[PDB]
């Protein structure tokens, strides 16, 4: 009953999901100036393998690759967290037009696209689901992508959007190592926040990174290619499928960096 559309956008998805209003919402302006510099905060850690990919699937929402979380070769820890949160998913935003796209927005500022590597707390909790209802059950790393240098490991990713630009439709993808979506810098902002999809669960360690990856033009328009709709249905495509920021609620905004 929701999606990205006139009228069912997410300034009506409160009317469904109540927590849309909450007070620990994401995503939310990171206003740079008022994060708090944290040294306190232990390395971020990215340890991903090359080969738990599972598949690649347009799921009417977005472009979503699948890995294989039953041991803890692909996780995230430090920073924030106090221990290692598996890779489950990881899955884009972006707009129809190149100035728009991003969820998070940098001093008012948003990106053609954002990156979401969606992990959780395997240690602690039985299911992804169960863990998704904990405040402490998962951790998404954001990565916001600009336009320029085409990025060579994105190809592989990029070229396999056409046999998934249906809705519903999907393809096997081994092999893809996310860590080649990530930026040189592990520098990070973090806050308490939640699901920007419904349910908007306030379940989710918020690390997004400093720095942004960039792939080329040719590439960002392959993710507009995608639709929205079946292969029967009219055809809608699937662009400015992101959630604006949301108010901010007194919470507190770390930096692993000073601005
Ligand atoms: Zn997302």
Redesign the pocket.
């Known amino acids: 009953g929701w999606g990205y559309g006139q009228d069912d956008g997410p300034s009506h998805w409160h009317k469904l999901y109540p927590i849309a209003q909450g007070d620990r919402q994401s995503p939310i302006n990171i206003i740079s100036s008022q994060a708090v510099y944290s040294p306190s905060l232990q390395p971020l850690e990215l340890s991903y393998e090359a080969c738990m990919s599972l598949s690649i699937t347009n799921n009417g929402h977005?472009v979503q690759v699948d890995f294989n979380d039953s041991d803890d070769r692909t996780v995230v820890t430090g920073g924030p967290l106090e221990g290692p949160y598996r890779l489950k998913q990881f899955?884009?935003?972006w707009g129809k037009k190149h100035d728009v796209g991003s969820?998070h927005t940098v001093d008012g500022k948003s990106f053609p696209s954002?990156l979401?590597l969606?992990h959780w707390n395997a240690k602690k909790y039985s299911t992804f689901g169960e863990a998704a209802s904990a405040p402490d059950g998962l951790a998404?790393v954001?990565v916001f992508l600009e336009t320029g240098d085409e990025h060579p490991s994105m190809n592989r990713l990029t070229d396999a959007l056409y046999m998934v630009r249906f809705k519903g439709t999907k393809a096997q993808f081994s092999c893809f190592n996310p860590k080649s979506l990530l930026p040189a810098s592990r520098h990070y902002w973090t806050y308490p926040g939640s699901?920007?999809?419904p349910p908007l669960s306030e379940s989710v360690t918020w690390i997004v990174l400093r720095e942004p990856i960039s792939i080329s033009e040719r590439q960002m328009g392959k993710f507009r290619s995608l639709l929205f709709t079946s292969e029967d249905d009219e055809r809608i495509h699937m662009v400015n499928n992101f959630r604006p920021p949301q108010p901010l609620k007194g919470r507190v905004v770390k930096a692993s960096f000073r601005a």
């Open positions: 977005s899955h884009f935003h969820e954002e979401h969606v998404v954001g699901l920007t999809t």
